[PDB]
Amino acid sequence: ITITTIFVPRDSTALALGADDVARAIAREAAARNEHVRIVRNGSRGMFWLEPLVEVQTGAGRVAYGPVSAADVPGLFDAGLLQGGEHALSQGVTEEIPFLKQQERLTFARVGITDPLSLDDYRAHEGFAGLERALAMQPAEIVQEVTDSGLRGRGGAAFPTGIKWKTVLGAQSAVKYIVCNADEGDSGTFSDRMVMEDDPFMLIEGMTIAALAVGAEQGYIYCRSEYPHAIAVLESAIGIANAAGWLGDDIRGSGKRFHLEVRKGAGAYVCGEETALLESLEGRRGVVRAKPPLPALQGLFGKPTVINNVISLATVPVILARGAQYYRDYGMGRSRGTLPFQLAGNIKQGGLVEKAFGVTLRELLVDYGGGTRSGRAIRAVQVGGPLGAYLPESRFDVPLDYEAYAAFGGVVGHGGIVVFDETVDMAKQARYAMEFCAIESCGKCTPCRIGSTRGVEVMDRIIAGEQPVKHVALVRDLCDTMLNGSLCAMGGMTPYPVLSALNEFPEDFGLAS
Amino acid sequence: ADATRIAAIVAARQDIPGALLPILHEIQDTQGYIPDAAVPVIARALNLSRAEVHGVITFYHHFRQQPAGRHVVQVCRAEACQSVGAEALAEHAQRALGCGFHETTADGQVTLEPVYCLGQCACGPAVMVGEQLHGYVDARRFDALVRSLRE
Numbered sequence: 001i002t003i004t005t006i007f008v009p010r011d012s013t014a015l016a017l018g019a020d021d022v023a024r025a026i027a028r029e030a031a032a033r034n035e036h037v038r039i040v041r042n043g044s045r046g047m048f049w050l051e052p053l054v055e056v057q058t059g060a061g062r063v064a065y066g067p068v069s070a071a072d073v074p075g076l077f078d079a080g081l082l083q084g085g086e087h088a089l090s091q092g093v094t095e096e097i098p099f100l101k102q103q104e105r106l107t108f109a110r111v112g113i114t115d116p117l118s119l120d121d122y123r124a125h126e127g128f129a130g131l132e133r134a135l136a137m138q139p140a141e142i143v144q145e146v147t148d149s150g151l152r153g154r155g156g157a158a159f160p161t162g163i164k165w166k167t168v169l170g171a172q173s174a175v176k177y178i179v180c181n182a183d184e185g186d187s188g189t190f191s192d193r194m195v196m197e198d199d200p201f202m203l204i205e206g207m208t209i210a211a212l213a214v215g216a217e218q219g220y221i222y223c224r225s226e227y228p229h230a231i232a233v234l235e236s237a238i239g240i241a242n243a244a245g246w247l248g249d250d251i252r253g254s255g256k257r258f259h260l261e262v263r264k265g266a267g268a269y270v271c272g273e274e275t276a277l278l279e280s281l282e283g284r285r286g287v288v289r290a291k292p293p294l295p296a297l298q299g300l301f302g303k304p305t306v307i308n309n310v311i312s313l314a315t316v317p318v319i320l321a322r323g324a325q326y327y328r329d330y331g332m333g334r335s336r337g338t339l340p341f342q343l344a345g346n347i348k349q350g351g352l353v354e355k356a357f358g359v360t361l362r363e364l365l366v367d368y369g370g371g372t373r374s375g376r377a378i379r380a381v382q383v384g385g386p387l388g389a390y391l392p393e394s395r396f397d398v399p400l401d402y403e404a405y406a407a408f409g410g411v412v413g414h415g416g417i418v419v420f421d422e423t424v425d426m427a428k429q430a431r432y433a434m435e436f437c438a439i440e441s442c443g444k445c446t447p448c449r450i451g452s453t454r455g456v457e458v459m460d461r462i463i464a465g466e467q468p469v470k471h472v473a474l475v476r477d478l479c480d481t482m483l484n485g486s487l488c489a490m491g492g493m494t495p496y497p498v499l500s501a502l503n504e505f506p507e508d509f510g511l512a513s
Numbered sequence: 514a515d516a517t518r519i520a521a522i523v524a525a526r527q528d529i530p531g532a533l534l535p536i537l538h539e540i541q542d543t544q545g546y547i548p549d550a551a552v553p554v555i556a557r558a559l560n561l562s563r564a565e566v567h568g569v570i571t572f573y574h575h576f577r578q579q580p581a582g583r584h585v586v587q588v589c590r591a592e593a594c595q596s597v598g599a600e601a602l603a604e605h606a607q608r609a610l611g612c613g614f615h616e617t618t619a620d621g622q623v624t625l626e627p628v629y630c631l632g633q634c635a636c637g638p639a640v641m642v643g644e645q646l647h648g649y650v651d652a653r654r655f656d657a658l659v660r661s662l663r664e
């Protein structure tokens with residue numbers, strides 16, 4: 001009795017593009033032909049211009065079809081879909097698609113391969129090997145191994161993760177916390193989303209290893225309200241892991257204890273900021289805390305707290321499973337390891353490209369993204385999210401590396417890359433940066449709370465062509481005001497999209513070339 | 514809103530650390546909004562002031578204090594969807610609906626909301642309705658998805 005395994009992604013981006021209808025159509029079609037299939041709802045390979053990307057297990061490996069719509073499915077069967085027959089939508093052996101093959105998926109190794117919620121799938125691809133090794137190590141040794149890897153904070157401030165863990169380990173306290181920052185607030189980012197939706201056991205393992213390293217028994221995943229799929233997948237994964245003894249009071253019979261729960265955010269971008277996040281968890285308004293206490297020492301409820309981004313925590317298992325030196329050899333300078341870069345915006349082939357630091361923007365734009373979606377020339381690329389600077393073409397050859405970007409005023413951030421073609425109006429981008437700040441300001445700082453709105457209104461005067469030379473000066477003083485009087489990068493980095501647009505594209509503001 | 518179930522939602526959560534937002538989520542998820550009458554119940558079970566509790570509700574854009582329409586359509590307005598046309602889609606959505614952002618249709622079927630990134634940045638312009646996602650949304654597809662809502 002012949003049963004063909006078929007993969008249809010359940011990643012929310014695949015879902016947005018019809019994946020469920022395709023899966024039901026594949027099921028209906030199989031039944032109408034009296035053929036037996038097993039439809040696996042995998043993660044997304046992260047090649048979104050091919051989603052929904054249907055894969056078929058054949059003797060040659062998994063082969064792919066994409067993008068598949070519900071209407072295409074009877075024709076897919078007719079062309080021999082169940083045996084990998086060729087079709088207008090054929091893409092071949094999935095792992096051979098260069099966009100995928102030419103990556104260094106250390107963190108994203110399973111994403112798109114596995115059923116996200118199958119412990120069997122997870123453990124058949126190194127899942128929980130990192131934990132098994134960490135369980136046989138001293139807490140300080142786990143900290144040292146994360147230190148030696150060169151891992152840095154993938155939320156974008158890139159603080160050295162191991163030194164942060166060492167602080168929490170050394171603090172003296174009966175209660176300690178692992179806090180996973182899943183606020184992923186930046187436009188152009190979806191790596192955290194994909195981890196939580198497509199490989200949540202990896203996040204769980206990473207936080208459990210963090211718990212072992214510092215002496216925490218309770219963890220929280222604060223996940224933005226804009227990510228309902230991540231939240232439901234994570235709660236299901238936590239239940240499955242607890243029931244199989246990967247969580248709870250006797251993890252794999254080791255006597256180690258770790259409990260995990262998801263908390264839903266509520267639409268405030270500034271709750272991505274680590275202390276505003278802690279305020280939110282505690283049931284308060286998300287106002288940034290002052291720092292006479294560093295959160296690693298007095299964080300959640302005043303306890304020593306590890307606060308890390310999804311990708312930072314998601315990279316701990318491979319670091320434990322394969323070793324610090326394996327991880328550290330990737331990258332360049334002090335940017336060790338890899339980053340899941342996210343190609344977004346006006347991009348022909350957008351999605352997830354995990355590569356060692358040192359890849360240049362241009363390589364990513366042309367060799368992976370394929371240029372713009374419109375087909376027009378790229379004019380500006382914002383890297384690192386809404387607080388990142390726009391890069392012009394002349395910056396596309398700087399290596400993506402925390403230090404080389406910071407030197408010229410670029411922001412690697414989380415690795416999101418948002419492409420704008422030549423139609424972009426950079427004065428309006430500047431307006432939006434000010435507008436976005438007025439919307440999200442926690443309210444503690446005057447240039448952030450109200451200076452932003454005044455920036456909107458001076459920008460309006462520029463957009464309608466009123467007194468451009470005068471009002472641009474006003475925007476620059478306002479930006480200098482924000483750089484000098486903001487308690488966090490929301491206010492302090494709003495000038496970065498504004499000043500780069502101003503300096504690189506003055507003509508959009510009515511100024512001479 | 515069901516006030517008796519609001520008090521049960523609250524009482525089940527009253528010993529959770531940082532209970533306020535989970536309580537607010539469960540009330541909104543089951544009732545549609547957080548009624549004013551709920552605030553003294555939340556305040557008293559949490560040993561918080563009514564003012565404190567109101568301050569948290571108003572701070573967080575996710576939370577609404579009056580019922581929305583039958584469907585909340587969220588149109589992403591952030592930079593990735595801007596780059597593939599979120600602004601034109603935003604203006605078409607207002608005309609096709611007859612209402613601005615944070616507002617509800619005259620027939621009560623749709624409340625129009627902005628959202629700042631759905632994590633669909635490679636497949637924009639993105640739209641979310643309830644928890645149903647839509648990518649590559651232009652004017653025609655927007656009209657179509659709104660068409661599907663009413664019927």
Ligand SMILES: Cc1cc2nc3c(=O)[nH]c(=O)nc-3n(C[C@H](O)[C@H](O)[C@H](O)COP(=O)(O)O)c2cc1C
Pocket residue numbers: 152153154155156157158159181182183184185186269270271272273274275307308309310312313488489490
């Ligand atoms: C406005 C603002 C928003 C932020 N949003 C996020 C976010 O969405 N996800 C994240 O991981 N870090 C975010 N951060 C950074 C966190 O404050 C902190 O640097 C990070 O979570 C630390 O984890 P890491 O060391 O692993 O990067 C934000 C900071 C600011 C000032």
Ligand code: SF4
Pocket residue numbers: 270287288440441442443444445446448449486487488489490491492
């Ligand atoms: S800069 Fe803005 S977000 Fe940051 S603390 Fe000040 S007011 Fe709040």
Ligand code: FES
Pocket residue numbers: 186187188189589590591592593594595629630631632633634637639
């Ligand atoms: S910017 Fe619209 S989905 Fe991310």
Ligand SMILES: [K+]
Pocket residue numbers: 574614615626627
């Ligand atoms: K609103």
